[PDB]
């Protein structure tokens, strides 16, 4: 075919793998921040359920 094919295919492969590197490191820092502080969707550890509390009138006022 020629040299242009190899050259430009190499360029494509290079941008692909560079972007992958970028995203892997980004994922590392993202997981770090999400775990150190639960601001994000991940590492949101469970809490007690709210809907199983009874809010009705009790037997004593100062419940």
């Amino acid at each position: 075919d020629g040299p242009e094919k190899n050259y430009e295919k190499t360029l494509a492969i290079l941008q692909i793998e560079s972007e992958k590197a970028e995203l892997r490191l980004k994922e590392q820092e993202v997981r770090r921040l999400m775990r150190a502080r639960g601001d994000g969707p991940w590492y949101q550890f469970p809490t007690p359920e709210k809907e199983f509390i009874d809010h009705s009138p009790k037997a004593t006022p100062d419940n």
């Binding site: 009138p57 006022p61 100062d62 419940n63």
Partner: protein, 57 residues
């Protein structure tokens, strides 16, 4: 950290019933019909407001 507020002795000085429990069980059914308005207001305050200090009167 925050001090508790409490009423004074004279904010509780009251003419008490000084009446026993059988004398009172006997007249329960009439004290539930007469003197129901005040009693139910006191109940509503005591359960709506969860503080005794907000309902002495």
């Amino acid at each position: 950290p925050g001090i508790v507020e409490l009423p004074t002795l004279e904010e509780l000085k009251v003419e008490e019933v000084k009446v026993s429990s059988a004398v009172l069980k006997a007249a329960a059914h009439h004290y539930g019909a007469q003197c129901d308005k005040t009693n139910k207001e006191f109940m509503l305050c005591r359960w709506e407001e969860k503080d005794p200090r907000r309902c002495l009167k």
